Amino acid sequence: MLSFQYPDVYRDETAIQDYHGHKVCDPYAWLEDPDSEQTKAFVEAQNKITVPFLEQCPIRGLYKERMTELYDYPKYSCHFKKGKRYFYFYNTGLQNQRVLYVQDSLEGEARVFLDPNILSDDGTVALRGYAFSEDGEYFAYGLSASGSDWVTIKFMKVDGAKELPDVLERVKFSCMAWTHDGKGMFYNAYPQQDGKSDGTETSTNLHQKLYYHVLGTDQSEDILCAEFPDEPKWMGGAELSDDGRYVLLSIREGCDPVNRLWYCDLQQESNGITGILKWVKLIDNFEGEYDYVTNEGTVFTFKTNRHSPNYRLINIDFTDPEESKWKVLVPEHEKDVLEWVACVRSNFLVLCYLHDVKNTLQLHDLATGALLKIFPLEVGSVVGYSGQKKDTEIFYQFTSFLSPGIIYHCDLTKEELEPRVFREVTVKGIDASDYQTVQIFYPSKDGTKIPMFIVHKKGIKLDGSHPAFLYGYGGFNISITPNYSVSRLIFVRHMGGVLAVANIRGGGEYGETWHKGGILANKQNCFDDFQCAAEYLIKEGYTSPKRLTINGGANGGLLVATCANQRPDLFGCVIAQVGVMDMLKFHKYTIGHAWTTDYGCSDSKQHFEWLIKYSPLHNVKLPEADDIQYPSMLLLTADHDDRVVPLHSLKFIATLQYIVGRSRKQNNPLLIHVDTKAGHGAGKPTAKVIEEVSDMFAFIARCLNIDWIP
């Protein structure tokens, strides 16, 4: 089965670093230079054994063909209104990128407004962020090449879809907010740096600045509106209040749901925007989140987590700003997380709640906060929404494990609010009635009850004979809610598989206390929760260890790699996508420094003591028992992943192959694939998505010897 040889990789035994008295060896530190011939040669040699391995079986061809078949369905974003026109994104099915469409009315003929597919031969130029002017006559949009986080902002006149000269460079992790006078737009950019800025470099991103761009001018003329040279990790995003009177500045440092909130009354500017604005520091600490919902004069509605881990709505009067004077509009729920809030039709609020990892959507009165209407949904997620203050209607998109989904429309001018199906798609060949979704709660090591979704064919015998695909993330206050995945459904239908998603701690499923439960010193809880999910699926007879595949991306890549090190006996197969593997060095590269609010930083002795215990790169260890080897492992990354620098995976696979792959008891493959012209994942063209999922389940099929079920 292993009809190849692992490439010889040079070990730099001199690369020894002292971490607070602990000596750490990093023999593959030279892989940190992406541009070197050594690194390029290493990548080439690895791809040379992985690709033939993945493609040897006709099962990949059968999966890709079926994936291409079943993924070929119409995909719509919500309709949204800007000015006198409606806009929406649409994919016929297999287009590399969705296309932005425009129509002059809800019943009128639609035409192409922005087609990103024509900007690249392989669909690797993607839209990343956009902002319409207040009156909807002008358009700003970000473009990213080859999956990099770097953005170029370009501009369009909407009427006639006319290209404008304005180009903004060095844009990354940026806001986009037009002042309501249409004169220009707020955005973020980074100062010039040495070396490259295309997404292949590893250079840390610091000193992000807020600029204002006056339309019709050169970027060189752009106004500097906020900077934090004493605080190089600070990031300030700007937005305009609904009335267009205030610029609100949300300043973040790290990834915790917290921000400073400064404001600038634009009326109070002496001569318009000409320099650093007269910021009024309403909230000048990082002790809570303050997310603008709406305002009425000086009374501002914010979604907050201040003393409310499940989130709530407060009113802050700018003329009476003390916390003691704040009014609680919609108090915190006992258990339900308030996911997001939008203001529509002047005085309505749309609240989205997460109840036991499922969405409910509600309409509330702005003045009192009182519940008015529940929008009836099935069990699943709200993944799209449209409806701002001046709008008199809402669009919202629903999805779930077995349903491609539905877009609903509701006219809010009507006395009795009737929401109707505006758009619906059904994937032919996938009979949703053949399958069921159950939610269970399994006890973790410490007795905590963890939610897990299980999707399987109806009527299966729980005798532990089915192959299983267990997914997890666990971090950064992210909630892994039900979603439609054709790729995972083919695994169920055509590979006889059971699919599982565990809502482990670190996520935001049960608020900030759930987040805190799997970060910093408590990070090990994530791995404990995920391992317990695996054991539950085994004990209940959904699967066996030799038939179980675990999967996660980025922070979830860290998850499955750590679980591989800690419990190799528990899994047959592990797929780690774009994973953070070097927990000691992660903070040094690109935006990695922002993740220390979840992980900690090896600069501190306390944090280093946490990190060394689970860091995938530093815990590759031959299993003590003779009957136990490492699971089959496939790492997936790409050369323009500047979110999680690919060196993470490169050093990890080298370590796996040397320490474990060399041993004679190891027959399970340990492989990496490094893609070109792709990045972390956002904006990845359909074609590449199909290639990836085909590789993944071809890896599973080969390593577990799974027959295709046509």
Binding site: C255, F476, I478, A554, L558, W595, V644, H680
Partner: peptide, 4 residues
Amino acid sequence: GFRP
């Protein structure tokens, strides 16, 4: 959005 700059989370991993």
